[PDB]
DNA sequence: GAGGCGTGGC
DNA sequence: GCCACGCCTC
């Protein structure tokens, strides 16, 4: 009940605001700036501008607690924890 | 590993 | 509107 009514558009979203999210794939629209020195790049999602970020400091907050290996998401972590058993 | 993106608690 | 879990496709 949350539609998405630019041109042909056949989306709805379950709140407000993820259509807000959705409607930057029509407009271009990127409102989050990587302000990393004489970088450039812009994101239509914050969370994709914190994966940016983590290319530039090579940050890698989550760590495998089995063994060396570390990783800038969370996924990438359950996905190589499952590898260990 | 990386990008896109749906989602829900806050 | 943040933020981040997590799933999908490559
Ligand atoms: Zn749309
Ligand atoms: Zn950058
Ligand atoms: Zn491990």
Redo the contacts with the bound molecule.
Sequence with gaps: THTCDYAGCG?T???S??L???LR?HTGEK??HCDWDGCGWK??????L???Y??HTGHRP?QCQKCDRA??????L??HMKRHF
Excluded: C, I, V
């Excluded at 994101?43 to 994709?48: G, I, L, P, T, V």
């Design positions: 989306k979203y379950t709140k605001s993820h807000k999210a959705h794939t409102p989050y994101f239509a999602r914050s969370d994709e914190t994966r940016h983590r290319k989550f990783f800038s998401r969370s996924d990438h359950a996905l």
